[PDB]
């Protein structure tokens, strides 16, 4: 059938950005299940909200069924932006061609895709509401607002969790003082700025505060390689996402003045992919590259061009708000790989017959 590889990420409201195989395993049997030969599916008792294309926007839509099957082979497609999707050969992709007279859209089976073709990718994801967070003493924020998203950006970029201490490592004391101010405003407690052997740090000693961030999904070990974007951020308004993104960039961003691009490099591959979804909530299209640096693999997210970059600014021309985005772009295929080995594949049935997935946001078809 038409299906995708199990490692394909899918954006969901309930679980955040999750591999479709893990979504399947979580929901397998929660509804009316049918097994027919090598195929199986569950009609979900309650649909799961994913994202899809409806009336010119990418919005939350209902997925009613989850499906697991087998395919004899697969097609793996890589694009110029660094998207890489692995799908069954009959999986339908939406392409765009630049012609004599203009732009032509048609559906094309993955097996017929060639380098030079351009597939539909998502530039802008709609939605987002202030997320309610369910509850010595601290105050626990009740909403994920811009202040908490900014603090989360410092913590995810440059911070660690230990059982008794929330730490931020950064040589810019003004940044540490801003994080400390946010700690006082948000949690009612503050920390101390310390000179450590390698870097300055702000240390906040509070087991309840650590527990707060643990509950948000910040890892306590192997954080550099394993952090993920919290599902609460992926459900947040664009202004909250932007506070997080700008805080991250302040910590780790570089600007190439001649390429005109902001670059961040992370050791977390799934973290990098989550950042691309957060950027799409802002209407920013990013590029992704793996880089081998000093004998290790890192993950580079880049933001290029005045249209992208101006959306990060705190001061913006007022039309930037009235100019409503175009939501879909067409991304050039650079490599196609034909994979004869059979494997399990997965699908989700939605009311639009499409959904948003891939390592960076891509329009996929049922």
Numbering used by the authors: -1 to 133, 141 to 371
Excerpt from the paper describing this PDB structure:
Inteins catalyze their removal from a host protein through protein splicing. In this study, we elucidated crystal structures of HEN-associated archaeal inteins inserted at the same insertion site (VMA-b), which is located within the A subunit P-loop of the vascular-type ATP synthase (VMA) from Thermococcus litoralis (Tli) and Pyrococcus horikoshii (Pho). The two three-dimensional structures highlighted a modular architecture consisting of HINT, HEN, and an accessory domain (ACD).
To investigate the structural and functional roles of ACDs in HEN-associated inteins, we decided to delete the ACD region from the TliVMA intein based on the three-dimensional structure. In the DNA cleavage and binding assays, TliVMAΔACD intein similarly cleaved the same substrate as the wild-type TliVMA intein did, albeit with reduced DNA-binding. To our surprise, the deletion of the ACD from the TliVMA intein changed the cleavage profile. The DNA sequencing chromatogram of the smaller cleavage product generated by TliVMAΔACD supported that TliVMAΔACD intein did not cleave the alternative site as observed for the wild-type TliVMA intein, similar to the digestion pattern of the PhoVMAAct intein. The DNA substrate containing only the alternative cleavage (AS) site (intein coding sequence remained inserted into the homing site) indicated that only TliVMA intein bearing the ACD was capable of digesting the DNA substrate, whereas TliVMAΔACD intein was not. These results revealed that the TliVMA intein cleaved the alternative site (AS) independent of the homing site (HS) but depended on the presence of the ACD domain.
